[PDB]
Nucleic acid binder design. Structure first.
Length: 95
RNA sequence: AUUGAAAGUUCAAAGCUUAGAUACCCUGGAGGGAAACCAGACUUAACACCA
């Protein structure tokens, strides 16, 4: 029980997604999608956390303190955040 | 021909112990796969006349 809760989830792209890795030199796709250490599309947990946290701080203005906890205080860190995202593995892609 | 002569600050000793470069952070915002372009040009040859 190192982790209080563990919540796996699937991320279903409703519309098309663009999560960028910035411009590279070994790509011809100037705004590429975030790749993997194998070449598969990925969503870095920094991108997951940033999007979910920012979104959460707007849907739940009442529970702002609970989120500046587990996700992070976001202004002067002063403490590690209790939550943890894992880089989103590509499960299945429409081909 | 000197209150002189003679006498090794010598010996033993670990800068050791405890200690996470950790914490906060969306590769994002802006950007019209457009611009130009005739589905068009032309009858010929043989021929009985003419010659």
């Amino acid at each position: 029980p190192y982790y209080a809760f563990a919540e796996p989830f699937f991320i279903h792209a409703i519309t098309h997604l663009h999560v960028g890795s910035g411009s590279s030199v070994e790509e011809e796709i100037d705004l590429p999608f975030q790749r993997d250490e194998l070449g598969y599309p990925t969503i870095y947990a920094s991108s997951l956390k940033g999007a979910i946290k920012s979104f959460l701080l707007k849907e739940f203005p009442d529970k702002r303190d609970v989120i500046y906890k587990v996700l992070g205080e976001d202004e002067n860190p002063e403490e590690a955040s209790l939550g943890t995202f894992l880089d989103a593995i590509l499960f299945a892609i429409p081909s």
